[PDB]
Design an enzyme around this catalytic site. Structure first.
Site, PDB file in Angstrom:
ATOM      1  N   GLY A 138       3.688  -8.805   5.680  1.00 19.01           N
ATOM      2  CA  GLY A 138       4.858  -9.201   6.443  1.00 19.01           C
ATOM      3  C   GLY A 138       5.043 -10.700   6.542  1.00 19.01           C
ATOM      4  N   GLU A 144      30.379 -14.826  13.975  1.00 18.64           N
ATOM      5  CA  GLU A 144      30.565 -15.245  15.362  1.00 18.64           C
ATOM      6  C   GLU A 144      29.228 -15.504  16.045  1.00 18.64           C
ATOM      7  OE1 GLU A 144      34.948 -14.223  16.158  1.00 18.64           O
ATOM      8  OE2 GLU A 144      33.535 -15.903  16.282  1.00 18.64           O
ATOM      9  N   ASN A 151       5.050  -6.983  21.945  1.00 11.46           N
ATOM     10  CA  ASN A 151       4.635  -5.639  22.323  1.00 11.46           C
ATOM     11  C   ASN A 151       4.329  -5.541  23.812  1.00 11.46           C
ATOM     12  OD1 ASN A 151       4.963  -4.766  19.731  1.00 11.46           O
ATOM     13  ND2 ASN A 151       2.794  -4.467  19.299  1.00 11.46           N
ATOM     14  N   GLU A 210       0.843  -1.185   0.000  1.00 16.20           N
ATOM     15  CA  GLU A 210       0.000   0.000   0.000  1.00 16.20           C
ATOM     16  C   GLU A 210       0.881   1.239   0.000  1.00 16.20           C
ATOM     17  OE1 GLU A 210      -2.101   0.731   3.798  1.00 16.20           O
ATOM     18  OE2 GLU A 210      -1.036  -1.036   4.557  1.00 16.20           O
TER      19      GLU A 210
HETATM   20  N1  LIG Z   1       6.605  -2.977  17.415  1.00  8.99           N
HETATM   21  C1  LIG Z   1       5.781  -2.502  16.496  1.00  8.99           C
HETATM   22  N2  LIG Z   1       4.801  -3.314  15.984  1.00  8.99           N
HETATM   23  C2  LIG Z   1       3.954  -2.847  15.047  1.00  8.99           C
HETATM   24  C3  LIG Z   1       4.069  -1.549  14.600  1.00  8.99           C
HETATM   25  N3  LIG Z   1       3.112  -1.344  13.681  1.00  8.99           N
HETATM   26  C4  LIG Z   1       2.401  -2.477  13.532  1.00  8.99           C
HETATM   27  N4  LIG Z   1       2.905  -3.415  14.381  1.00  8.99           N
HETATM   28  C5  LIG Z   1       2.427  -4.795  14.527  1.00  8.99           C
HETATM   29  O1  LIG Z   1       2.012  -5.287  13.269  1.00  8.99           O
HETATM   30  C6  LIG Z   1       0.882  -6.114  13.395  1.00  8.99           C
HETATM   31  C7  LIG Z   1      -0.071  -5.853  12.239  1.00  8.99           C
HETATM   32  O2  LIG Z   1       0.456  -6.342  11.028  1.00  8.99           O
HETATM   33  P1  LIG Z   1       1.328  -5.397  10.075  1.00  8.99           P
HETATM   34  O3  LIG Z   1       2.781  -5.523  10.435  1.00  8.99           O
HETATM   35  O4  LIG Z   1       0.848  -3.978  10.179  1.00  8.99           O
HETATM   36  O5  LIG Z   1       1.084  -5.954   8.593  1.00  8.99           O
HETATM   37  P2  LIG Z   1       1.179  -4.929   7.368  1.00  8.99           P
HETATM   38  O6  LIG Z   1       2.589  -4.428   7.216  1.00  8.99           O
HETATM   39  O7  LIG Z   1       0.210  -3.794   7.577  1.00  8.99           O
HETATM   40  O8  LIG Z   1       0.741  -5.755   6.070  1.00  8.99           O
HETATM   41  P3  LIG Z   1      -0.783  -5.636   5.596  1.00  8.99           P
HETATM   42  O9  LIG Z   1      -1.677  -6.164   6.683  1.00  8.99           O
HETATM   43  O10 LIG Z   1      -0.997  -6.415   4.331  1.00  8.99           O
HETATM   44  O11 LIG Z   1      -1.092  -4.185   5.337  1.00  8.99           O
HETATM   45  C8  LIG Z   1       0.251  -5.775  14.729  1.00  8.99           C
HETATM   46  O12 LIG Z   1       0.073  -6.935  15.501  1.00  8.99           O
HETATM   47  C9  LIG Z   1       1.210  -4.845  15.429  1.00  8.99           C
HETATM   48  O13 LIG Z   1       1.501  -5.323  16.721  1.00  8.99           O
HETATM   49  C10 LIG Z   1       5.051  -0.728  15.111  1.00  8.99           C
HETATM   50  O14 LIG Z   1       5.149   0.425  14.712  1.00  8.99           O
HETATM   51  N5  LIG Z   1       5.914  -1.205  16.064  1.00  8.99           N
HETATM   52 MG   LIG Z   2      -0.542  -2.530   6.167  1.00  9.95          MG
END
Ligand SMILES: Nc1nc2c(ncn2[C@@H]2O[C@H](COP(=O)(O)OP(=O)(O)OP(=O)(O)O)[C@@H](O)[C@H]2O)c(=O)[nH]1
Ligand SMILES: [Mg+2]
Ligand SMILES: CC(=O)O[C@H]1C(=O)[C@@]2(C)[C@H]([C@H](OC(=O)c3ccccc3)[C@]3(O)C[C@H](OC(=O)[C@H](O)[C@@H](NC(=O)c4ccccc4)c4ccccc4)C(C)=C1C3(C)C)[C@]1(OC(C)=O)CO[C@@H]1C[C@@H]2O
Ligand SMILES: Nc1nc2c(ncn2[C@@H]2O[C@H](COP(=O)(O)OP(=O)(O)O)[C@@H](O)[C@H]2O)c(=O)[nH]1
EC number: 3.6.5.-
Lengths: 146, 432, 440
Positions: free
Chosen positions: C146, C254, C206, C71
């Protein structure tokens, strides 16, 4: 009849771009409206009809099979016995339905080399098969329980 | 880019759409003439979701207006925002449906549907990457139910991949305004259960209850109801238009909400609500919004969520807030009311947050719930349907337009099957 | 020359990358526009270090990174942000909708059509490199992109480059809090690529960081920015040995030699000891013994799992700042004396130590205090399994009824592909319960 992607298409009926609607008779259950129901009197007629139906079916090639099926197929025979002892008996005593069903094979996508339209056909086939598995499991559990 | 096409059918849908366009325009800063007069730079970043460009630096909304009575079209044109729409999109006829579903679906609508579809194809072709559709209409009426259902069927046939939504006003239990509401409602639900991908159920009785008890108004009119519905409609699709910390496309909501294909009926809600003259008492924050959002009085569906179980739920926040507070509050709500949440989904709260709140609201929240209790609504219609079909009270008006009793019977059976499915999960136990 | 390539996938990866690159730009004295005025004042040195930045003719430095998402919003925040002039314009957005929390969309239908551009950009960056050491992929389980796109990319990278190391930092689902109802499906499906192709995967949660922020840092309403800053500090501490001088240095090889006793046991945990606010920064010595004892506290773990229920199999300590080997030897002896920390019998040594002179930096507007000594621990324990077990339970509760399955099936996935993955997961867990059984 055939089910290609949630649309019923007739095979004995000649080239007809339209689809056929599905309606439920309140007493007799589901059925399909304007199915070209054909009579038969010789083995040659049914043989030729079967050949034409197999010819007009939608088939595509893939890595798993050179000639695979892209649609579920249903063959139905309605058979009537008429006992005509005029002194005693009456006609059209027994009506029977024989159904023969050929289902599409589960597609693994990456192993079959599907791409584009083939992939969407595989997806629809998998959805239908998963629904079939769910009903089968549910109905089995239901009859087993009671 | 994610372009949405908007369609409106019937008096109810047209008036709701007019108020909705009068809202979104402010959120993005568009004058009634079309020119842009705004302050922030994020307003033009994603304006193409709803609006098309025009040569004089003008913006025209991507809407289609449908009816079979020129009166509503005249009223909309002779209005504050009449000049914003494209004239060619005003599709209409004469000799309206007359509160008859058959005339809308088979006889009169079948003539105008071709022109409506031509306009829809032209509008959708110019889009760079179409996301989905949305349509506003009323089920208890004539034109709305029939033509909306026919258009939904045709569009689903032509564009099988994209998302379809619907913001439908259902018949109310007691406040009634048409004698043949049950026939139209049943015949419309019989097709809505099959074709569309999401549906939000609005009821006039719930909106009047919110207006009189929460907002403390004295003479509510249809303008305020349209306001509430427009607020919800704008809040649902915020994440396509503004940046945020957790985005939520329409498809993502569709995936997380519906667990099975036939259960796509939702109850919407919006928070907050201070009724004015009492804003100085309430401290606006995240737990306060969560408290108001899950309350039963706030729901717009005119059905108590305490009589069933939440299959799942989604919350879309708009504001500048901390993520821990949101997560903690959703967990607390799930743990406290443990009886009212289904037990075979370990976590059934979807969360999204956006950074840009409404014009004058430091914070806001939208709610989309999917619960079994909605079955009650369908049951009511079904009961009334039987009470008028056992003796064929007003049937001939339909049969004169090319229908038969079989259609009514299959529609009733389909709605009863829907009610049975929703009831299958409603009771406790079940478990593993 | 020591060189690494960073890949950030999905919203979580991109945001973590923003925090990371803010830290890296601050550490070497690079302005947001890429210029480095200190060179005119210093007059020498390679402080524009090659581990992360490539230098062009006009003095501008461009980082070695690739951002990917399906996106446009999250990357468009960067295209018009403060760092708009730092990155190459090639940021690889998909001009379409997103995976919508659907693994199948991110692996089969929409995940393709952009994989080739990503591979081409990575090819160009690797070809420009001279002595590439490894890849650092940032992603998050539970997201459609992801999970799916990370799986596809990792598979292609393993096929293509082959022998290069591939680390991995990820956000694992929390036991209780969550933001999606279909997380377990995505995580269990993602198990395969992190098990087979990745070389060493670090886990983060988290809830753990929320608790650490609440108690150590005294922040009552933290947001994602603090989480990303802490993770960036951890990653910088891991990678610092490639950049600055030190008494004892540790390469990525290492880590991959001392932390992975067997190929299928490469899922260690990571902790950072001195997390403390400015107000509490006084009143405390923060000596070597204190910071190294803080690492083994179960409350400071970055994943909600109790290390006491298992056994420690390996440990790497990375020290930054004014540290002496006498003190770290004494600390190791003290930790070995205690009984609560249990070491497996077949690892009599247990510890690996590295020391670096460059102390950690402080970001403006941050929350961590300025400190003279810092520690990062990477520990390989058998407590991890516990967390996995919890997730497995959730999966079963939804798979008995086939909930949400039709969404996956309608995008090219086959039903059986679920079950296989689950069984695979069960196999890994059992091998983390035998590797620790006492020998006989
Ligand atoms: N530590 C941390 N975790 C995050 C953050 N943003 C999102 N997350 C984690 O990401 C998860 C949601 O999935 P995303 O990583 O957003 O997946 P995406 O990149 O949006 O991929 P799509 O769903 O297809 O849009 C949640 O469970 C959050 O806990 C962040 O800024 N920091
Ligand atoms: Mg997303
Ligand atoms: C002065 C002030 O801030 O007071 C509030 C207020 O008291 C409350 C009660 C407002 C008020 O709303 C109502 O009284 C109301 C009446 C009928 C139907 C629905 C609402 C308010 O009128 C509504 C108004 O909301 C907005 O202006 C939003 O930005 C919203 N507006 C529109 O819907 C809109 C309508 C026509 C044209 C343009 C916009 C919005 C939301 C998203 C995107 C754009 C705009 C607000 C905050 C208030 C008043 C003025 C009292 C509430 O409404 C909204 C949408 O905020 C009712 O529940 C909220 C809670 C608020 O506290
Ligand atoms: N919420 C809302 N409902 C309306 C409005 N106008 C009419 N209705 C409802 O719409 C129903 C009648 O539907 P109608 O618009 O006549 O359908 P149509 O004739 O096919 O366009 C009645 O039950 C009204 O309660 C409105 O402005 N807002």
């Amino acid at each position: 009849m055939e089910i290609y992607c949630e649309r019923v298409r007739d095979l004995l009926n000649p080239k007809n771009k339209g689809n056929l609607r599905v309606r439920e008779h309140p007493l007799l259950g589901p059925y399909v409206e304007d199915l070209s129901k054909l009579a038969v009197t010789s083995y040659n007629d049914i043989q030729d009809l079967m050949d034409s139906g197999n010819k007009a079916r939608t088939v595509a090639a893939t890595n798993m099979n050179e000639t695979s099926s892209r649609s579920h197929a249903v063959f139905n025979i309605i058979f009537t016995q008429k006992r005509h002892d005029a002194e005693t008996n009456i006609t059209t005593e027994k009506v029977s339905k024989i159904s023969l069903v050929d289902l599409a094979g589960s597609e693994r996508a990456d192993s079959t080399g599907a791409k584009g339209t083939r992939l969407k056909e595989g997806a629809n086939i998998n959805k239908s098969l998963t629904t079939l598995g769910k009903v089968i499991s549910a109905l089995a559990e239901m009859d087993s329980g009671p | 880019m994610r372009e949405i096409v908007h369609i409106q059918a019937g008096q109810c849908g047209n008036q709701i759409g007019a108020k909705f366009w009068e809202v979104i325009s402010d959120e993005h800063g568009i004058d009634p003439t079309g020119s842009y007069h705004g302050d922030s730079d994020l307003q033009l970043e994603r304006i193409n979701v709803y609006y098309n460009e025009a040569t004089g630096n003008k913006y025209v909304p991507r809407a289609i207006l449908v009816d079979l009575e020129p009166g509503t079209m005249d009223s909309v044109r002779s209005g504050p925002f009449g000049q914003i729409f494209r004239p060619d999109n005003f599709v209409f006829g004469q000799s309206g449906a007359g509160n008859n579903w058959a005339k809308g679906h088979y006889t009169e609508g079948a003539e105008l549907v071709d022109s409506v579809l031509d306009v829809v194809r032209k509008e959708s072709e110019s889009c760079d990457c179409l996301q989905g559709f949305q349509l506003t209409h009323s089920l208890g009426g004539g034109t709305g139910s029939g033509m909306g259902t026919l258009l939904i069927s045709k569009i689903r046939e032509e564009y099988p991949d994209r998302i379809m939504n619907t913001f439908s006003v259902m018949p109310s239990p007691k406040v009634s305004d048409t004698v043949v509401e049950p026939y139209n409602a049943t015949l419309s639900v019989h097709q809505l259960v099959e074709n569309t991908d999401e549906t939000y159920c609005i009821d006039n009785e719930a909106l009047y209850d919110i207006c009189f008890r929460t907002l403390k108004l004295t003479t509510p009119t249809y303008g305020d109801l349209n306001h509430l519905v427009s607020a919800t409609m704008s809040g649902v699709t915020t994440c396509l238009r503004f940046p945020g910390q957790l985005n939520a496309d329409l498809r993502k909501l569709a995936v997380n909400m519906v667990p099975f294909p036939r259960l796509h009926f939702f109850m919407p809600g919006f928070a907050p609500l201070t009724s004015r003259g009492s804003q100085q008492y309430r401290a606006l924050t995240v737990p306060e919004l969560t408290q108001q959002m899950f309350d039963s009085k706030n729901m717009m569906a005119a059905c108590d969520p305490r009589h069933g179980r939440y299959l799942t739920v989604a919350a879309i926040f708009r504001g500048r807030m901390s993520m821990k507070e949101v997560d903690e509050q959703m967990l607390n709500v799930q743990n406290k009311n443990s009886s009212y949440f289904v037990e075979w989904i370990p976590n059934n709260v979807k969360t999204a947050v956006c950074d840009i709140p409404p014009r004058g609201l430091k914070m806001s929240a939208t709610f989309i719930g999917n619960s079994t209790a909605i079955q009650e609504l369908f049951k009511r219609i079904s009961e009334q349907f039987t009470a008028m079909f056992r003796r064929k009270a007003f049937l001939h008006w339909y049969t004169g337009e090319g229908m038969d009793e079989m259609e009514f019977t299959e529609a009733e059976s389909n709605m009863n099957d829907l009610v049975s499915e929703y009831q299958q999960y409603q009771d406790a136990t079940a478990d593993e | 020359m020591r060189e690494c390539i960073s890949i950030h996938v999905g919203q979580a990866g991109v945001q973590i990358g923003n925090a990371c690159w803010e830290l890296y730009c601050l550490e070497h004295g690079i302005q947001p526009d890429g210029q480095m005025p200190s060179d005119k004042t210093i007059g020498g040195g390679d402080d524009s270090f090659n581990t992360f930045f490539s230098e062009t003719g006009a003095g501008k430095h461009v980082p070695r990174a690739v951002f990917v998402d399906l996106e446009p919003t999250v990357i468009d925040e960067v295209r018009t942000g403060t760092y708009r002039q730092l990155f190459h314009p090639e940021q690889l957005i998909t001009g379409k909708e997103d995976a919508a929390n659907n693994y199948a969309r991110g692996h089969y239908t929409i995940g393709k059509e952009i994989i080739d551009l990503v591979l081409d950009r990575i090819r160009k960056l690797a070809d420009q490199c001279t002595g590439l050491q490894g890849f650092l992929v940032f992603h998050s389980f539970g997201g459609g992109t992801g999970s799916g796109f990370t799986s596809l990319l990792m598979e292609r990278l393993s096929v293509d480059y082959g022998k290069k190391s591939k680390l991995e930092f990820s956000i694992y689902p929390a036991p209780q809090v969550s933001t999606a109802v279909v997380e377990p499906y995505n995580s269990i499906l993602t198990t395969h690529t992190t098990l087979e192709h990745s070389d060493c995967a670090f886990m983060v949660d988290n809830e753990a960081i929320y608790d650490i922020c609440r108690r150590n840092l005294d922040i009552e309403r933290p947001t994602y920015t603090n989480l990303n800053r802490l993770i960036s500090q951890i990653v910088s501490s891991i990678t610092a040995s490639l950049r600055f001088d030190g008494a004892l240095n540790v390469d990525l090889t290492e880590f991959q030699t001392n932390l992975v006793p067997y190929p299928r046991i490469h899922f260690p945990l990571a902790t950072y000891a001195p997390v403390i606010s400015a107000e509490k920064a006084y009143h405390e010595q923060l000596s070597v013994a204190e910071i190294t004892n803080a690492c083994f506290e179960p409350a400071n773990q970055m994943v909600k799992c109790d290390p006491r229920h298992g056994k420690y199999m390996a440990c790497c300590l990375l020290y930054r700042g004014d540290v002496v080997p006498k003190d770290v030897n004494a600390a190791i002896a003290t930790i070995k004396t205690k009984r609560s920390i249990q070491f497996v019998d077949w690892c009599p040594t247990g510890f690996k130590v590295g020391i670096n002179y460059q102390p950690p930096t402080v970001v403006p507007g941050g929350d961590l205090a300025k400190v003279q000594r810092a520690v990062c621990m990477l520990s390989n324990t058998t407590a991890i399994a516990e967390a996995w077990a919890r997730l497995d339970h959730k999966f079963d509760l939804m798979y008995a009824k086939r909930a949400f399955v039709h969404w996956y099936v309608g995008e090219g996935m086959e039903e059986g592909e679920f079950s296989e993955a689950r069984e695979d997961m069960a196999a890994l867990e059992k091998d983390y319960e035998e590797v620790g059984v006492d020998s006989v």
